[PDB]
Design a binder for this molecule. Sequence first.
Ligand SMILES: N[C@H]1[C@H](O)[C@@H](N2CCC[C@H]2CO)[C@@H]2OC[C@H]1O2
Length: 330
Amino acid sequence: STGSATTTPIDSLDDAYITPVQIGTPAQTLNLDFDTGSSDLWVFSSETTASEVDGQTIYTPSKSTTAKLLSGATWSISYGDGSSSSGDVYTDTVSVGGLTVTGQAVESAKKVSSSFTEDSTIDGLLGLAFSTLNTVSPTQQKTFFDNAKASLDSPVFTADLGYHAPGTYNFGFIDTTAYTGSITYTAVSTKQGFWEWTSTGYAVGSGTFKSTSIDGIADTGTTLLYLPATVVSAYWAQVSGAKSSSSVGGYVFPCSATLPSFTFGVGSARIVIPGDYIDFGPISTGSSSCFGGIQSSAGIGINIFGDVALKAAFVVFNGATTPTLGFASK
Ligand SMILES: N[C@H]1[C@H](O)[C@@H](N2CCC[C@H]2CO)[C@@H]2OC[C@H]1O2
């Protein structure tokens, strides 16, 4: 089997991407944030505290003839931005772009934090990291990909995110028309439950390539590119007037600037992030200070190749017995 679904930016800045997902019988379509940095599929639901729902589409398990309570199971998760959610669990039929998994754990939110409530466009999360990170207790549950894997033509999925445009998530096949040149594959460590890999270095604009190992994760659920402070400083030093603002929460730059590109290494290959991809616009409406798309990972504990990096590439998440990551230009 295979699946193919379009993923769409939630706003003009590509702050996140949503992908339609069919849950239950008859189908209830929710727009979920596909997140290769976590491993829970959770949704706004008929069980979500009413005051914490503001415009989201909800899953109502009582209206699904294939829904079954996963008796006694609960979940609770917190993310890198301090957001959180928790609740109980149903199993139900879940389909993504024509690919169907029966008995998928669908985690129903009883509570969500303010950032989720305020995000009217995101109806929940679909985790695509390794199932070892799944938070369901007392019986840990498998991700949609984990469940689908054996049935797939190939045990892979791909992320093809657009810059200020829709893109594609494919399951079970590699679309050879979707990228240019070749795909460079690189080793993955699953020790922390992430798609963790080691970049071979970086360049700023037309500058020389710096060969240096940068361990990080491929994370579609993180908006920006988070790298060591040394690397981030070298980038922003090439933008006149750019500076780190503790009050704003990171590097800002004059909205009048032209941003340089940023290159990262994948083995001997190179992925070039155009300067425009690194612009996240005025810090507040009308401001002439703009927020940067490359930020320090210093206060995170891990480097994160988020959407800013991934959208510059065609990315293969290879879930073979020995997992690997592939990157191609496009
Ligand atoms: N990386 C996580 C992120 O920190 C969460 N935030 C919650 C509101 C949107 C987003 C802000 O960027 C979201 O859930 C899991 C994943 O994406």
